[PDB]
Design a protein around this nucleic acid. Structure first.
Ligand code: MG
Ligand code: MG
Ligand code: MG
Ligand code: MG
Ligand code: MG
Ligand code: MG
Ligand code: MG
Ligand code: MG
Lengths: 196, 115, 238
RNA sequence: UUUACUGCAGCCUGUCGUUGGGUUGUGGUUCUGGAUGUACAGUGUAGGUAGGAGGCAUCGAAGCGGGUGCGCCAGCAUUCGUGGAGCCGUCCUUGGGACACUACCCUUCCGGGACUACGACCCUAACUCUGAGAAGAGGACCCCGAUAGGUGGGCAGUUUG
RNA sequence: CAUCUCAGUAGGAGCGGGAAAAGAAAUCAAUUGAGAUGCCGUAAGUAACGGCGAGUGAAACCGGCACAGUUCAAACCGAA
């Protein structure tokens, strides 16, 4: 079958535990642990996924590995008097996924760019790693572009901290239509947050 | 396997130059991969500096299953320079000898010896 | 919530329970020596350390840097020290415990190699080497227990100076008051049965008695492990 | 305040992940050498069972060995031989099962090799501590995320007609 | 009074414009149909939940306001 090499990379990352990618994981995890919270990397770790999510090789497009802990929302026991249903907090995991946390940290680190998408790249017993694709709206190469000039608009500022990314809309309960989405569209706030 | 001697690699680069000026070469990972899949490659040249390594990982087993002679090259810069390009090229492929056919077959025999 | 206890207040680290660090002369640790090195040095002065109530020695080494050292008894101004692997056994030198003979006294022993010394450091204490097996050596700690240490551990030979510090009774609240000003401890301490039931598990009542047994299990939550923590026995020997 | 009712932190322990490479004892999983299948024996070893029997055989079939799969040191296999016939059974050892080659597909035999889960031991390369660093010390344990059970006036909400 | 209710309310952190959010079916229907989204009316205090107690509580069909559809990834060419 006449197939592109993106297909082969996709297949290789389809089942990481049963290919050559496991050894590469073993080497890469050490170097990744030595690094910081947010790091700029020249090339994406998985080319096919990045191209699928809207990555091109031009100026003004940046890619970054973020580092986020595992587990639920670490929550404090209430100091004062609750009612025995609000008193417990150890089993109460959060309401925000880990991709959203990763993208928000990346946005906080880069004040001039704007988040586009992200994807899963690895994980171990203490950490998870994602890569976030960032686009610069004030670069002339982006402005001339016809498939990316929508980001040079006054409604795309802070695009990641208002739940407009793909993971944000997954977490808002708006990944589908029909039954079950009675109280999740066009927004959570519109229904007094009884959805989600 | 055994890494090919330096004279073999220089012979491969010279044949690459000759087929460039005279024949036809697909250069670029995507075009060379599709050429191997269809099956027309006289010889496959692959660099060994790729990070991430997934770019050229599939080439080896695919070529060996398709019965295609693949060689390894030390760096991207010289492979890119050979193809007639100011930028590095990860993998090229001699689709058509043009005039360097004899280098094609004798490099194939040399690779059989090394394997 | 009946008020937290004194132990939890020490946990927070309020200024009343923090050591007055600026009074102390210096931290005591062994000289740092690379592999297969042996540096020497002769004492320059004998000095008083307010953090332990015992003397310390100032030693100037051949490289140039001077260090305060835990002073073993008999150390005198002028004597040279030969810390290193090739040192001989004498009162004052620092040598591995693997090649220390049985019966010799040591002090300032380390836990793992190149710690600087953690055991046997108060006044007049000392430890002994008992046995030398191939992989370990057993030293009898001043508490009275046997500890199995690595043969490549460093410890100065002798006993710590200042022996007999507690043969002189206080006989006043004033003298013990003066000692406590250079420590983190609080002085004086109220007794639990004289407090209120908010303050302590034992407080309250029309007369001063504990009310509940003083021995507490090892699994009691913080804020309750007060008294005889997980005692195996009580009383004097009849 | 407590051995009032209901809960929640803290702590103790099992399981899953992080988490790798060997030493062997475990059990099947899985695989070979023989239908191993045999008491009323046998000329025969129920070549499971079974067209209740018909092809093999100096053009290879027998009684015997320490005994060759194995068992009743009998004897179907032709194996290392040994004599140089065990033929089917409509002479059924007239059967627990009565038996003949292109069938053993299957009592079984079980280097049990093989991935697996357990208990113990060893190793270093993950990981942890110390050091400016070389390096040293531990080590797949601990810490950590999740889940299950306990203890728990440490703390919370209430009731006490 | 403990599940429930008060209520996702009061309060907090982040982002942000003249509006914002949503938006072109892996949809809703029922036998056979409709054809992006938002807002208003109705369905309806109905279905559903609940010491089945007190209470909480929709959507689709249907009528209106206003109407608008498209762009990438890949297969083919390989710097055009
Ligand atoms: Mg940060
Ligand atoms: Mg908008
Ligand atoms: Mg109390
Ligand atoms: Mg109470
Ligand atoms: Mg109340
Ligand atoms: Mg602002
Ligand atoms: Mg949208
Ligand atoms: Mg409600």
């Amino acid at each position: 079958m006449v197939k592109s090499f993106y297909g082969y990379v996709r297949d290789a990352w389809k089942n990481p535990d049963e290919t050559y990618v496991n050894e590469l994981r073993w080497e890469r995890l050490q170097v990744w642990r030595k690094q910081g919270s947010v790091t700029r990397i020249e090339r994406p770790t998985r080319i096919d996924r990045a191209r699928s999510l809207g990555y091109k090789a031009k100026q003004g497009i940046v890619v970054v590995r973020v580092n986020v802990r595992r587990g639920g929302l670490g929550h404090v026991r209430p100091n004062r008097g609750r009612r025995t249903q609000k008193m417990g907090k150890n089993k109460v995991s959060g309401g925000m996924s880990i991709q959203r946390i990763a993208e928000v940290r990346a946005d906080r680190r880069y004040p001039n760019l704007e988040v586009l998408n992200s994807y899963w790249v690895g994980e171990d017993g203490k950490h998870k790693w994602f890569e976030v694709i960032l686009v610069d709206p004030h670069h002339p190469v982006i402005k001339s572009d016809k498939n990316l000039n929508w980001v040079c608009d006054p409604s795309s500022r802070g695009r990641a901290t208002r739940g407009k990314t793909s993971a944000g809309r997954k977490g808002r309960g708006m990944a589908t239509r029909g039954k079950g989405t009675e109280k999740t569209r066009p927004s959570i706030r519109a229904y007094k947050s009884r959805g989600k | 396997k055994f890494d090919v001697p330096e004279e073999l690699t220089n012979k491969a680069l010279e044949a690459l130059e000759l087929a460039r000026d005279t024949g036809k070469i697909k250069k670029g990972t995507n075009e060379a991969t599709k050429a191997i899949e269809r099956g027309n490659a006289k010889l496959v040249l692959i660099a060994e500096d790729i990070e991430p390594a997934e770019i050229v990982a599939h080439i080896g087993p695919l070529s060996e299953e398709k019965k295609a002679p693949y060689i390894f090259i030390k760096n991207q810069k010289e492979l890119g320079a050979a193809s007639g390009l100011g930028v590095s090229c990860a993998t090229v492929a001699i689709v058509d000898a043009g005039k360097a056919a004899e280098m094609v077959q004798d490099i194939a025999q040399k690779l059989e010896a090394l394997k | 919530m009946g008020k937290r206890l004194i132990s939890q207040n020490r946990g927070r680290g309020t200024p009343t329970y923090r050591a007055p660090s600026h009074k102390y002369k210096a931290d005591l640790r062994h000289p740092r020596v690379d592999e297969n090195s042996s540096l020497r040095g002769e004492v320059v002065g004998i000095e008083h350390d307010p953090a332990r109530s015992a003397p310390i020695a100032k030693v100037a080494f051949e490289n140039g840097e001077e260090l305060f050292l835990l002073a073993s008894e008999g150390i005198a101004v002028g004597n040279i020290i030969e810390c290193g692997d090739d040192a001989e056994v004498k009162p004052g030198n620092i040598v591995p415990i693997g090649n220390v003979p049985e019966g010799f006294f040591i002090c300032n022993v380390e836990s793992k190699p190149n710690d600087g010394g953690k055991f046997v450091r108060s006044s007049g204490v000392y430890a002994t080497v008992v046995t030398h097996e191939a992989t370990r050596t057993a030293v009898s700690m001043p508490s009275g227990n046997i500890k199995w240490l690595n043969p490549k551990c460093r410890a100065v030979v002798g006993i710590v100076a200042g022996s007999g510090r507690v043969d002189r009774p206080w006989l006043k609240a004033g003298k013990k008051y003066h000692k406590m000003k250079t420590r983190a401890a609080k002085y004086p301490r109220v007794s639990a049965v004289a407090m209120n039931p908010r303050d302590h598990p034992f407080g309250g009542g029309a007369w001063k008695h504990p009310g509940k047994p003083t021995t507490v299990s090892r699994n009691a939550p913080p804020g309750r492990k007060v008294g005889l923590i997980a005692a195996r026995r009580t009383g004097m020997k009849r």
